[PDB]
Structure 1
Amino acid sequence: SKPHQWQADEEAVRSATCSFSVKYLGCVEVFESRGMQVCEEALKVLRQSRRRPVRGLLHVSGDGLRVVDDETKGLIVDQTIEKVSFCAPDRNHERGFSYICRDGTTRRWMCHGFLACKDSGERLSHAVGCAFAVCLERKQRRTRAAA
């Protein structure tokens, strides 16, 4: 909400200690878990399937997204942000997003989906979008040529 509270959360992730409400759909099986095109379709799968969405808050602290419901109070995606395959917002066409984890401790290429609670690309998009910032703040990511 412009300079005020948004300035706080933007810094929270920097120090690893943020959070935002959301309805984390669930998890699905995939043959990639390392891209963006898989997230766009993965989310769709979370629906067609029986992956009922939770009603809690995503514990984002620039280290590992730990989504937890507000009913059962149980961790769903207990994975590290540095180890996980990272997130990739669908297409910001309706405030939709989706994570991804290369097996690790989730069996196999497990695709994830979570639609922002407030729904306004101003709670999870910029929140988790920075969550990784702390991971590769110096853009350690090796995707381009670099120099």
Structure 2
Amino acid sequence: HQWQADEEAVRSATCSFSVKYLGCVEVFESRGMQVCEEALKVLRQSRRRPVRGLLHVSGDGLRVVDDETKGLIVDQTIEKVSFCAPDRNHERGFSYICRDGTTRRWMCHGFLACKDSGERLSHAVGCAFAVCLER
């Protein structure tokens, strides 16, 4: 069912679900998965307001199409970002880091799953990269 649809989802251009892209914050590491567990909190403080969109884990980079504006916000790529990283709070929050090469510094973006399950997006992304290097 779920995986029976997520199997070809990443292969297409949408293997995730509604998300809460808070924005982007600065970090000082970009060499660990725990770095995202902290950034997610920073964006939860203030300034960076969350957005209700639709994360589409595509094998050629993620894409968050707003579900209230459809103007898109995250036109980045999976192979472009340093490396993904979940959390250890409630598995309802994920984030990715992106150092220099486009920001001239370490900048990690954070977001949260509006589905609350830790499978419709988590495991989905964990399979995206596995297919990204298929060739």
TM-score range, shorter chain: 0.7 to 0.9
Relative distance call for 1:5 and 1:36 in structure 2 (3 A) is closer
Q: What's the offset of the Cα at 1:17? A: 4.4
Cα distance in 1, alignment partners of residues 56 and 14 from structure 2: 8
Where structure 1 has 5 or more consecutive residues not aligned to the other structure, the ranges are 138-147
Instruction: Please tell me whether the aligned partners of residues 14 and 133 of structure 1 are also in contact (alpha carbons under 8 angstroms).
Output: no
Q: What's the offset of the Cα at 1:112? A: 1.3
Aligned-pair RMSD on alpha carbons?
Answer: 2.0
Q: Deviations over 1:7-62 (max 9, x none)?
A: 11123214554341111221101122332121111111011131111111012111
Could you list the structure 1 runs, at least 4 aligned residues long, displaced by more than 6 angstroms after superposition.
none
- TM-score, normalised via structure 1 length: 0.79
Identity percentage of aligned residues: 100
Partner of 1:114: 111
How many residues align structurally? 134
Q: What's the offset of the Cα at 1:90? A: 0.7
Q: Deviations over 1:56-110 (max 9, x none)?
A: 1012111211123222323322212112112111126242211111233345321
- TM-score, normalised via structure 2 length: 0.85
Larger Cα Rg: Structure 1 or Structure 2?
A: 1
Where structure 2 has 5 or more consecutive residues not aligned to the other structure, the ranges are none
Instruction: Please tell me whether the aligned partners of residues 92 and 121 of structure 1 are also in contact (alpha carbons under 8 angstroms).
Output: no
| 1:48 aligned to which of 35, 45, 48 | 45
